[model samples]
Target: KKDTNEIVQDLKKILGIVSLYKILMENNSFIIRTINKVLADSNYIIKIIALFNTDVVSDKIKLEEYKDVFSFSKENVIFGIKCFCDITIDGIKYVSFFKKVLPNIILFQTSCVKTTQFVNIFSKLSSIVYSEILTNERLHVLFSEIMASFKTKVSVEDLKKRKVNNIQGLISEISNNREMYKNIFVEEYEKHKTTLISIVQCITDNYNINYKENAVDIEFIFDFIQEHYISKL
Candidate 1:
């Protein structure tokens, strides 16, 4: 009897785990390969159970609210990880049931191929990773640096604390220096554009469903980076 909200929460939890799987695979390919092999073995059992319980599987999928599967909100992503922690505790009990439900779960996933929503999550991850590529810094350091840099960049009010500088100072500085900054940024973006594009490809491949029709619009991601990200630079 889970409501729509709860169903969305469960799907988000699954996506959150998928995201973590990607992040881990980025750093520990050998370790994840081992894990993947194990999962691959269990997947056969899951597939068999799902085949036997196909009707029951469809019944549970009715609980899902497909429209919200890709909300891609920060909260949705994080809350899903929290949900997975709970799943871990009761994981043994649910493993068989979880296996039994895999088919419809995947079917539901295939149905909700709203690539725009996928783009939201994709861009956020790419923004963080590409920033690391430019800075040659570790993820945590660059993350905070980016946050701090943004805080200062936007906080025009901070100038008031220093001296009699007004919005005119900010305006004059941007007018004189902003285009140079923009040029430099674009130079760097172009230098790394291929890497970023391939990184997007990596993620798109990770989320790929087996269905022929269930494909992500990778051009959407590329065009988006050009129009929204690179053009902004």
Candidate 2:
């Protein structure tokens, strides 16, 4: 109850900012659990990489250089990196297996072996996961764009000295070890996709009434996760 009251007050604090994101129909304790887990995991999620990778199968490798995230082959496709809330607790379950947080994400060709941020994100048996939705593409894009804005092109000489030469390569550095993120799609969108479509539709309807085209293009709809939040309560 203390948590709920505190969160209600906190929710009120970000009310306007919250509008930029989809508001759930209910406060849902799970929603509380989701953000809490994500922020805690990433410690306030690192700023966006001004630039952003290559990929080898040896688990992971440290990217010593920066390149346009879009430059990587589809093997290191942005969709290749995944994210979302996947957790089950108190006989309730929440997961977004088909989610990928960063659109057109650049893959880090660096070795992510047994100990690394990538490894920590998508784990295996004897592991734990967190979060509650794929319902924040607007916010994701906002974060991505802002993070990108803070960057300017840098030089290899700068990188050599361990200084910021360009920011695009930094895109791969956003901490993915939070409650969201995954490497694969584990569910069927055929059935799970409709709810989010409806949710977006509702939001878009309200969005367009006041503005000409606040909603992103339809292409983004198909590109982003079609499956969003789900709960049995």
Best by lDDT: 1
Give me the runs in candidate 2 sitting further than 4 Å from their true place.
1-185, 188-190, 209-215, 222-233
Off by over 4 Å in 1: 1-176, 209-214, 217-220, 224-233
**Clashing pairs in model 1, backbone N/Cα/C closer than 3 A:** none
For residue 141, what is the lDDT in candidate 1? 52
Local lDDT at 109 for model 1: 40
lDDT of 1 by residue, 1-233 (tens): 21223323434544555666334334344333333333334233333223323332456552233222312343443344333222111101223322322222322243333333333333444544555467543434534554565455455465466542633343344444555545654655566556655655554454442123444456575787577534432
Task: Compute each candidate's TM-score over C-alphas.
Answer: 0.26, 0.21
Candidate 2 lDDT, 1-233, residue by residue in tens: 01223433444445634554133424434344544343333211111121111121111222212222213343333234322112111111111220222111123322222223333333321132112123455535544543453344224355447543323223232222211212112232333345545544544443342112244344354644333211100
Choose the strongest candidate by TM-score. 1
For every candidate, C-alpha RMSD to the true structure in Å:
19.1, 22.9
